[PDB]
Ligand binder design. Structure first.
Ligand SMILES: Nc1nc2c(ncn2[C@@H]2O[C@H](COP(=O)(O)OP(=O)(O)OP(=O)(O)O)[C@@H](O)[C@H]2O)c(=O)[nH]1
Ligand SMILES: Nc1nc2c(ncn2[C@@H]2O[C@H](COP(=O)(O)OP(=O)(O)OP(=O)(O)O)[C@@H](O)[C@H]2O)c(=O)[nH]1
Ligand SMILES: Nc1nc2c(ncn2[C@@H]2O[C@H](COP(=O)(O)OP(=O)(O)OP(=O)(O)O)[C@@H](O)[C@H]2O)c(=O)[nH]1
Ligand SMILES: Nc1nc2c(ncn2[C@@H]2O[C@H](COP(=O)(O)OP(=O)(O)OP(=O)(O)O)[C@@H](O)[C@H]2O)c(=O)[nH]1
Ligand SMILES: [Mg+2]
Ligand SMILES: [Mg+2]
Ligand SMILES: [Zn+2]
Ligand SMILES: [Zn+2]
Lengths: 339, 347
DNA sequence: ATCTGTACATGTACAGAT
DNA sequence: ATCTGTACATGTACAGAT
DNA sequence: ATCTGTACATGTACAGAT
DNA sequence: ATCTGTACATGTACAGAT
């Protein structure tokens, strides 16, 4: 039943090949153009495709163009925890996010203009968004969200001190090492000079290193169903989102965040046995429903930032989604059979 | 259970002793390391790498023996395996002073290393420290220190190579079911080391850096022995086995062919065979130590203990240790086992 | 003025001491 | 159970070199 | 600084065995 | 139906060459 839904959601090797061939061509060319400002940006592949939790089709790719910036001093934007002003080549741009993003965007647009071999344009800017989004066609439509990121090597900002609570799951050495990696700021505004913390590199490591046992999902270990539960939850939200515009405030990052909390609460690999796929997916739904009822879903890395605060999503939107989730749950998920 | 807990208490190093030992050792090592740079010496660029029992937290009784590698990156090198041994190699291509004819001479390089070290120790006035008489074929320059208490420091010259590990290790390090494939792949991306062992130009592979990572990352669960996880008894078993051999070795010269590396190697195989943290529960310390002894005994009787990293190299071959020596040790181990380990009460 | 090899500054796991 | 010394990895300041 | 070569993890596809 | 073995595909870290 759920195994059959997963088969439908499984990407095809043929489609992966053709999509990657084109995406890589464009990304490689844009990256080269950035190397003569922005000289020295490096590529960092992130999100669902590179975490192996993309579903249905290879039609959405996420790439960070990270740029190492020396001595930078952060000031937290009021008490938000996730948003910062940045202070001290890039003198052209207090470091303005929208100004930097504009130049980044312009360069990208100029280079896409010179691309004749592939059918590719740049999507109209969504205000406040950090992304420069490319729309490709080898007939099939493919999105590429290209994210400018500042890389900083200092200690992570104080607001994350008590975040990433993996100690009982992945452990203290993993946590200490992860927090020795750089941190990232992307120009998602809150206004025009604000940046937002990104942990896409950390999320990627976790997705690919997700077990309490080192062998989880390896050739000489036991398969778990952690990723399959993530896929099913993503698909449920995607399907619901297609039908009801009441759910515009919700995104896949809410699901990702929720499952991180679940994986922390249930650290044992044996609590995610493939044979218990139903129970596992069900307990995930129950957890997400408690998050909705209590209007509380803390950022996994920034515990004081509630993604489900009133200020961000209306009670009515949360109650709408609850009713819709409870319905699918108690009727054998008819929405999975939809197209 | 509790008898063995009491032995471990005795074996536990004291923080006072650790402090005083480390203070002195670090002073000497730092000074020797600086001498290798600050002068236009062939060893310019050596880096320090702390290895062995003290740095793995399995040193027992006293902080009286420290192991330190002075590693030197050597680019374009071609290795030739010395007669299918698997562990021994000739090296070919600053260091031209030792490059006796395409071949990089181990003993020549070790001699110069040794001379420099001797000269620098001679200039040390703060501390009571001399250089021990060279043991032929040994790779070590050994320092003997006294803040009254006697402390050995074995300083090992090592060539660092960043290429893939030699073919003879391909099927070694069988940690797939225990620490897993990602850990193994990453470990094998680290450099490999050659220490100075026809004979005078041969070098031997070293995996001290890999052994160190394993000792400190020894569980199938990432939380093994961490503040938010469960204690295992893997290291405690290693200490007990080390102590049994150490005690036996100080009494009987019949056991001169044996060393702590045999015990370390044996326990690596045991940890591979019994990968689950639950097979090394603290409450089962006795059973765990017992099964280790039984395994070591089988190795001795069948004359077979494969190097953990170089499977075709048998540390217990006839060619290396007489059957007599192995039978002597078997009898001695079986005796202690079946009489409540009287040798643990000694001293 | 700028760059750099060396030493120090900071954080934390591990294990011993209390 | 909490506190504390050592080791070790990574960042960063800087007298000496360029 | 950039580019490639190598090795192997994480996938998908499918047949034969269980 | 599930598991196991092989083949085929992509991603990615890092060394050595340029
Ligand atoms: N902090 C933060 N990170 C976000 C947010 N949205 C997206 N991200 C990050 O950007 C990545 C890409 O976002 P998306 O492409 O929308 O989602 P995805 O995880 O790739 O999954 P898909 O919906 O299958 O594409 C996510 O995996 C996160 O790492 C957000 O609101 N906050
Ligand atoms: N890799 C990565 N991609 C990100 C991150 N933040 C945002 N993105 C990308 O940018 C897209 C839009 O970012 P959002 O966080 O949704 O921002 P927005 O669309 O301006 O605002 P809302 O969706 O209303 O919150 C995401 O779908 C991702 O593809 C991040 O931290 N990392
Ligand atoms: N391949 C190999 N490595 C060895 C051998 N002897 C020692 N080593 C390595 O060098 C390290 C130091 O050796 P020792 O000081 O004799 O032993 P140890 O492991 O530190 O334990 P102690 O007996 O407490 O000193 C070991 O941990 C090994 O990594 C040997 O015969 N062969
Ligand atoms: N760190 C480190 N120390 C090593 C290594 N190999 C040897 N040593 C040290 O050097 C000492 C002598 O090396 P061995 O190979 O044991 O000496 P040998 O002269 O060949 O003979 P025995 O000591 O009788 O086995 C060891 O006890 C260690 O202290 C190595 O790979 N790494
Ligand atoms: Mg995505
Ligand atoms: Mg030692
Ligand atoms: Zn898994
Ligand atoms: Zn343990």
């Amino acid at each position: 039943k759920l195994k059959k839904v997963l088969d439908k959601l499984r990407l095809k090797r043929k489609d992966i090949s053709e999509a990657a061939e084109t995406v890589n061509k464009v990304v490689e060319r844009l990256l080269r153009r950035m190397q003569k400002e922005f000289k020295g940006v490096e590529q960092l592949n992130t999100g669902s495709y590179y975490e192996h939790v993309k579903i249905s089709a290879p039609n959405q790719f996420n790439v960070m163009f990270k740029l190492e910036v020396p001595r930078i001093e952060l000031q937290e934007y009021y008490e938000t925890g996730a948003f910062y002003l940045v202070k001290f080549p890039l003198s052209h741009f207090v470091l303005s996010a929208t100004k930097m993003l504009s130049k980044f965007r312009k360069i990208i647009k100029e280079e896409v203009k010179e691309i004749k071999d592939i059918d590719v344009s740049v999507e109209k800017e969504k205000p406040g968004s950090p992304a420069v989004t490319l729309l490709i066609r080898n007939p099939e439509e493919i999105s590429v969200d290209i994210i400018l990121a500042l890389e900083s090597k200092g200690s992570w900002p104080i607001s994350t001190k008590e975040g990433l609570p993996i100690q009982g799951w992945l452990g203290t050495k993993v946590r200490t090492n992860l927090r020795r990696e750089p941190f990232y700021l992307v120009p998602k505004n809150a206004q025009g000079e604000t940046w937002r913390l990104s942990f896409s590199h950390t999320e990627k490591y976790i997705l690919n290193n997700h077990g309490i046992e080192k062998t989880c999902c390896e050739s000489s270990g036991a398969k778990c169903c952690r990723k399959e539960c993530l896929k099913l939850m993503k698909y449920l939200l995607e399907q619901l989102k297609k039908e009801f515009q009441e759910l515009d405030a919700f995104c896949s990052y809410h699901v990702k965040t929720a499952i991180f909390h679940m994986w922390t609460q249930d650290p044992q690999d044996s609590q995610w046995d493939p044979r218990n796929l139903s129970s596992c997916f069900d307990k995930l739904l129950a957890f997400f429903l408690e998050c909705l009822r209590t209007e509380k879903l803390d950022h996994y890395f920034i515990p004081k930032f509630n993604l489900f605060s009133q200020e961000l999503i209306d009670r009515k939107s949360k109650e709408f989604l609850s009713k819709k989730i409870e319905y699918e749950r108690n009727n054998g998920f008819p929405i999975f059979d939809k197209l």
